[PDB]
Ligand binder design. Sequence first.
Ligand SMILES: Nc1cccc(-c2cn(-c3cccc(C(=O)O)c3C(=O)O)nn2)c1
Ligand SMILES: [Zn+2]
Ligand SMILES: [Zn+2]
Length: 231
Amino acid sequence: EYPTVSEIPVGEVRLYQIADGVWSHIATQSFDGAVYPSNGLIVRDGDELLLIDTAWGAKNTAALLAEIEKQIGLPVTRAVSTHFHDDRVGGVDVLRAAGVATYASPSTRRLAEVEGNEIPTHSLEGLSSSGDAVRFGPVELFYPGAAHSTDNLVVYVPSASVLYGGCAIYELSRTSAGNVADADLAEWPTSIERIQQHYPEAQFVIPGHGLPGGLDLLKHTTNVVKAHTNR
Ligand SMILES: Nc1cccc(-c2cn(-c3cccc(C(=O)O)c3C(=O)O)nn2)c1
Ligand SMILES: [Zn+2]
Ligand SMILES: [Zn+2]
């Protein structure tokens, strides 16, 4: 069973195996007075591992590297951050010092900089325009357009039919918007439509926070975002 927020002490990291060579990592962090869960992804890349997003903070991310060594043993060699917030780049300095090459789009790195957040080392090219995709080892990276943030990326594992939507996708139980201070509410439904046109056979959809499900997370997220708009 997928771990939930009350089951994970802040500072601990769970791994959840989704398919052969695909796991999610789950951690918790206090933010604005409450403790939230947060998801990232781990994708096997032959004798290496590709990491998607930190575990939200230097300490959680150190524990993430430890859990990966304990439970998988393959080396993390590259990391991608899917947007510029703490829950995606917080812990990038730990990844870098540990020898992980850290990547993000130029927009993400620039917004992280403006924000005073840790900054992935390398820019990802080819993701500047809505609908752009690029191959990155065992995954495709997709910029669906502005949504949760103007820079947010989604990650697809074609061999596993795993779509990692990051914080642009909500879990099914979520009935209100959440942190939208950096969102583009008007653009967000359109960006989700691009995701749906691109990955309609996704069998496992992972939100930035909370429980994975099926393709219905997409439409559901559109509904919640619009409802937040209309009031
Ligand atoms: N340094 C900085 C600046 C602004 C925002 C953040 C941040 C906000 N985070 C969130 C906390 C709880 C929930 C969510 C969500 O996706 O709904 C987020 C988020 O990613 O915005 N995570 N990092 C950090
Ligand atoms: Zn965010
Ligand atoms: Zn988030």
